[PDB]
DNA sequence: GATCTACTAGTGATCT
DNA sequence: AGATCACTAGTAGATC
């Protein structure tokens, strides 16, 4: 039950010239909170049928899992590779990714074990060989942080609530003028 | 597509890259009221930008934790200055205009100051840079990263304060650990 | 107030 | 150096 509040955080830019934040739990325990308090916009990554840390990638607002730039999607799976017991030396390794929302906490939760509400929403992409330059490019953007996971999620939800409120009020405002017209 | 008009709480956010591949967040309040909260809830790591002796919005730049105003990459600092210029009513066309920048922490608001008016605790910590002419190729790049969001500024600052306190706790814990290991060393 | 029970937790030690 | 693990050591309800 080690607090070990430390979470690794990275930054990966795209050839689309969009910057994306990718985060990893230092701890197999810490991961549990990442799971407890992860966001709708997060995409979960792990090696299939092997043990690895749990790299996550956070999409920009309103983005969808398929929209991941391929260069960016590549950065996540390489990371999950080097931070796998067997991956760091294995070639042709298989990484699974799914949205945080498709993750379901098993009753035999253990540590480092998750399920998926719908296996169809599980996607797979394969890593062929160790690629040191992705890793070293990432390490320069690595930083250690001690977040209040629960707090940050609420913030996002709040921003969202206000964003919907503005959308919905402008929507109901329009029917007001149309009823008169 | 961010297809939204105007509603109180709207804050623009942009993104600018570094040659070392560190990404920086730039955020701006175009609005006189909006500006005021950005001023209340700004961060220690924020750098404030404005056109000199001219009316302009309040562009802010957020450094990574523990980064310092002098180490600001020139590429990014220029993107801030080009923004506050283009979001200046006369600046958007003026050549050889002066932008002042200072950390948010150096910002001071006296009882004389009304809404959208700010001062500087220390004039020494105020810096200046002049931009010569519009360089739309920058602005086109920055607009591609524009996003509108209605944050709970008070909340987000607190989140950051919390991480910091957590980082202090952790440091203190490892000290207590090492101090413990030393007592054992000869007992 | 006195055991009593059940829970964190700080300490030692032995696996990988 | 690190983590699981293993007794002791201590705190919290709670309980009669």
3D architecture notes:
2 copies of one chain form a homodimer. Chain A is α+β, with helices and mostly antiparallel strands and 181 residues long. Chain A folds into 2 domains: 7-147, no CATH class; 149-181. The first copy, chain A, contains 4 helices and 9 strands. Chain A has helices at 31-37, 70-82, 132-139, 149-180, and strands spanning 7-13, 19-25, 42-47, 55-58, 93-99, 103-104, 115-116, 123-127, 143-145. In chain A, the strands form 2 sheets. Chain A has a 7-stranded antiparallel β-sheet, with helices on one face. A two-stranded antiparallel sheet of chain A has the order 6-7. In chain A, a hairpin with a 7-residue loop joins strand 3 and strand 4 (55-58). In chain A, helix 1 (31-37) runs parallel beside helix 4. Chain A is globular. Chain A binds a DNA duplex (16 and 16 nucleotides) through residues 1-2.
**Main sheet specs of chain A:** 7 strands, antiparallel
Tell the overall outline of chain A: globular
Largest interface: A-B, 30 and 30 residues
How many distinct beta strands of chain A? Answer: 9
Q: Specify the structural class of chain A.
A: alpha+beta
Strand line-up of the largest beta sheet of chain A: 8-5-3-4-2-1-9
Span of the ends, CA to CA of chain A: 64 Å
Radius of gyration of chain A, in angstroms, nearest whole number: 19 Å
Order of helices and strands of chain A: EEHEEHEEEEHEH
How many domains, in number, for the residues of chain A?
2
- Work out the helicity level of chain A: 25-40%
This entry's quaternary arrangement is: homodimer
Strand content of chain A: 15-25%
Question: How many helices of chain A?
Answer: 4
């Amino acid at each position: 039950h080690h607090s070990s509040g430390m979470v690794f955080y990275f930054t990966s830019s795209s050839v689309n010239s969009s910057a994306y934040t990718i985060y990893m739990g230092k701890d197999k325990y810490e991961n549990e909170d990442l799971i407890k308090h992860g966001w709708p916009e997060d995409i979960w990554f792990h090696v299939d049928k092997l043990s690895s840390a749990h790299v996550y990638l956070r999409l920009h607002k309103g983005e969808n899992i398929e929209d991941i730039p391929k260069e960016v999607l590549m950065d996540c799976a390489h990371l999950v590779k080097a931070n796998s017991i067997q991956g760091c030396k294995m070639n042709n390794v298989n990484v699974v990714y799914t949205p945080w929302s498709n993750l379901k906490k098993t009753a035999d939760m253990d540590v480092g074990q998750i399920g998926f509400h719908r296996q169809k929403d599980v996607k797979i992409v394969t890593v062929e060989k160790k690629v040191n330059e992705i890793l070293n490019r990432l390490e320069k953007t690595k930083v250690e942080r001690f977040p209040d996971l629960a707090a940050e999620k609420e913030c996002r939800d709040r921003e969202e609530r206000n964003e919907k409120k503005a959308q919905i009020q402008e929507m109901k405002k329009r029917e007001k003028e149309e009823m008169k017209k």
